[PDB]
Amino acid sequence: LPKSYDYDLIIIGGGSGGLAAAKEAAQYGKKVMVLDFVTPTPLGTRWGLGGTCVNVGCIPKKLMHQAALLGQALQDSRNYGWKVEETVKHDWDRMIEAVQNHIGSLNWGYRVALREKKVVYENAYGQFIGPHRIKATNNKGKEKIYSAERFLIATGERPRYLGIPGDKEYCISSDDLFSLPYCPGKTLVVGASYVALECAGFLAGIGLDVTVMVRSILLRGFDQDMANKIGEHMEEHGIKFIRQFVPIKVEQIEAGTPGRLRVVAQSTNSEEIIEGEYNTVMLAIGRDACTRKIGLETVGVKINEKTGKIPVTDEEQTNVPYIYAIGDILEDKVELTPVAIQAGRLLAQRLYAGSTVKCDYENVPTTVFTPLEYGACGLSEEKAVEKFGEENIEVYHSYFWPLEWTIPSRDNNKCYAKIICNTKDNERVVGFHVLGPNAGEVTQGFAAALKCGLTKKQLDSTIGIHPVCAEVFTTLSVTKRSGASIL
Amino acid sequence: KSYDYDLIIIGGGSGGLAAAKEAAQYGKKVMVLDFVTPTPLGTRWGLGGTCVNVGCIPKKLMHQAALLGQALQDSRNYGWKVEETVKHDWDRMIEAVQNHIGSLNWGYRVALREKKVVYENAYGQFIGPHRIKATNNKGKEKIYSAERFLIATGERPRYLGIPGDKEYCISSDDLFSLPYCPGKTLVVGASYVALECAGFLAGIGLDVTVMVRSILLRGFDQDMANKIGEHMEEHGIKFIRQFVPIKVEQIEAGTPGRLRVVAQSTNSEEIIEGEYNTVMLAIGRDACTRKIGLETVGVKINEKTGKIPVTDEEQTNVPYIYAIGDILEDKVELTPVAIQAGRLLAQRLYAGSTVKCDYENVPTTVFTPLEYGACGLSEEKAVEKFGEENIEVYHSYFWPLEWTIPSRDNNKCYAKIICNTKDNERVVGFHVLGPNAGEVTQGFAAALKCGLTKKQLDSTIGIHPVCAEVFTTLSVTKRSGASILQAGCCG
Ligand SMILES: Cc1cc2nc3c(=O)[nH]c(=O)nc-3n(C[C@H](O)[C@H](O)[C@H](O)COP(=O)(O)OP(=O)(O)OC[C@H]3O[C@@H](n4cnc5c(N)ncnc54)[C@H](O)[C@@H]3O)c2cc1C
């Protein structure tokens, strides 16, 4: 009668948002349970507690990015006086081992964090079966049913495939790459998402022959001027591109570790068809919300059956009152770990602690870890013009050259900076974009500045820090309208 | 009213060249005098100022060489097949650093020619109202008149009045061009210069020691300072605390030679002595305001400190004479600040701008082995100004993803913001000890210019996985008592 459900809250999904909400909730003394299960990849790769970010996302992605940056660091050191050979060899295996070992340490940590906070953790797949009731199936098949006063859906997504011959059977994806047991060799990454380019990037940085087949534009959604510059930088530094082509079939010329596959691709506007041979073929074309097979119908949760995303209120509530959702699965939000975490944390506070602070998904900063990092926050130049009108938007930009690059004598005028201003609003800074080293580190603070209503005037009154990249933003004086060169 | 120039600028450094260029842009006739008086050992350098030749630029570049050494070690675990120990070539480094400086020197000259600014490589001194004498290198003098003057003369490495220093010791001015590897070195003092150089020299593979009179980094937050101290000590750099040297003597000339430093305790009658190959003096700097005939024109300066008191518009007591840069009294001794002032000043005069240079919450970064960025009040200064009870301090440790594979330095990086509870917990102080601290600090500075509040900070989302994000989620205050050991195995 008065709440005798099994738990005050059940969380489907032990990833970024999941674990965040779990911990926050436990802190206010609620009986919480977290179900987390990892469904193997078509090739049978699986991993521990943590979510996408910990095992197959940010964490390992960044670390390999770093291995690539360090190779560059080995070359840069020659001119600064370190006596190193001109060509240093890299060991895939040694790397993966190290990365997987860190991951393992994180898996275990999350497990312990849960135990310590008195949160029950079942490594089982969940699916609702009826109001306030869920079924959990473990790895052996054994099932059990639990009731709970509320539910949080934090299930995340997974690498999408092409419906084409040979993919699930021969191709790998983000899920497999970070634990690959052999050097991928001549690789072909397919798609032009953040993931696509980031991986093509580190793969090239560690010495492999890489090619990237794109269907249309690079980084759809991101500022196109910037994207194109990332493209250009990648192309100038190894990575080869095949533009306007989608593959139609992949066939195994020979199994191995790695083997040899042949990819047959077709033009997206010609009847032209090509074919090439590669050791590995990574599919990085998009990801699919894990919202379909969890029996949402039995409980009444309305999801956009088209996209897979779960519409939700500004408080992360679904149509069904006692069921909430956060994370990648949300519809029209931001598909990033910190967001998932913020939502999870604040939601729990809103329920179990009287907080009334809603997660703010506006001008969420982001960074794409391509060989030349790109950081960003706010409107792209396109989306800015559209929203306020070409006439009311001023664009201040400038190239720049990292002091650290002068001795090695490389890449002058590749790094780029631009802010977007709203003339109708005291030249408010509505867009912040930076292409260059340590882009994430540079962007974080300017994000807190946009949350404060940074004005070009106030920016101009800030003094830069010399000599560091980030200062280029304190002295932007050339506008794009003007016409002046910044080259 | 028939003067030779609309403006004469003494000093072709950071603020000098900035005002020069800005003024020329509004079509005024401008002249810049820049002369470099050698170091007791006779080192000299081109156009540019302290920062270009013997400051920021070469300082950071070497800091970088030290970081790359660490990058070489870090690369092994990420799979790169590198030796355990790589040797460093001092000569090759300096040649490269000096080559960049050179290109910068030339650059600045061309920038002046192109903007139609007259450059005289001569030392200047006022001789009487609106008139100055310029003495070149050979001795030949000339006199010029101008409707207004800008004093942007900067400072120079200060010495100890003690036996053997000017004769056997090097300073920031010499180090960046040193023609030989300094070998076992002893750095005297604990200024940011002191620590930064001790830092890179150690990072490059040298035996380094640091003799300190009292506290490290006087002026900066002490909790932070101490942490840098501790980090340096734990990573090579040796320290001798509470000791000032009393005499330095050459046990044997050479490249480098061998010197013997004799030092006296600062609270005991104890005296010690050690032998070193080089001895760098980094105890402070002196304002170049004394030998420029300021009396002949009436310019009033603080005769004690050497600094020139000035208005909020950078004006001296003498209306047609202005001053910017390190020289100023109670300002901020940083290149970007000199530049801002110089630029804005020229606009105020020659363009009707009414925008004054804002010296409040100027961000800064001490490039020690573990960088330290900062902006606004220190914790100490915040407490004093608003009262212990009204100050809340949010802090946390953090561990760079980049350092996990090489498995090193867990919980060394540290972050802390100071808030004023009486003012919607405004963020009055921002301090971060970790990699790329300048890059991390720059943006939060623009935030403080906007009145960033802890609430607004909390509403900002972090970028993952990046160091700077630790600031978006500070929940532990110092008052509370909670421990902040953030990162063992997880969270
Ligand atoms: C290659 C790659 C790189 C990325 N890089 C970054 C980056 O640098 N920065 C950033 O912010 N974001 C990055 N992301 C995105 C980030 O990983 C996601 O935004 C974040 O992980 C979403 O957290 P989540 O909890 O909502 O989804 P998830 O983290 O994926 O949590 C989902 C968990 O739920 C489990 N699960 C699913 N269904 C069930 C069920 N029915 N029962 C039990 N358990 C279930 C899943 O197996 C999974 O472990 C990256 C993603 C990828 C793929």
Ligand SMILES: Cc1cc2nc3c(=O)[nH]c(=O)nc-3n(C[C@H](O)[C@H](O)[C@H](O)COP(=O)(O)OP(=O)(O)OC[C@H]3O[C@@H](n4cnc5c(N)ncnc54)[C@H](O)[C@@H]3O)c2cc1C
């Ligand atoms: C080792 C070191 C590291 C530093 N690192 C940093 C850093 O990382 N970031 C930062 O912001 N700041 C740094 N600084 C401080 C920065 O260099 C100064 O704040 C800045 O250079 C001051 O510019 P200025 O024009 O006021 O003086 P200066 O730049 O030094 O310009 C002075 C010029 O005037 C010339 N001159 C002097 N008298 C005469 C005369 N009578 N006639 C003709 N010419 C004359 C001098 O030779 C000199 O070239 C550092 C300083 C040092 C010493």
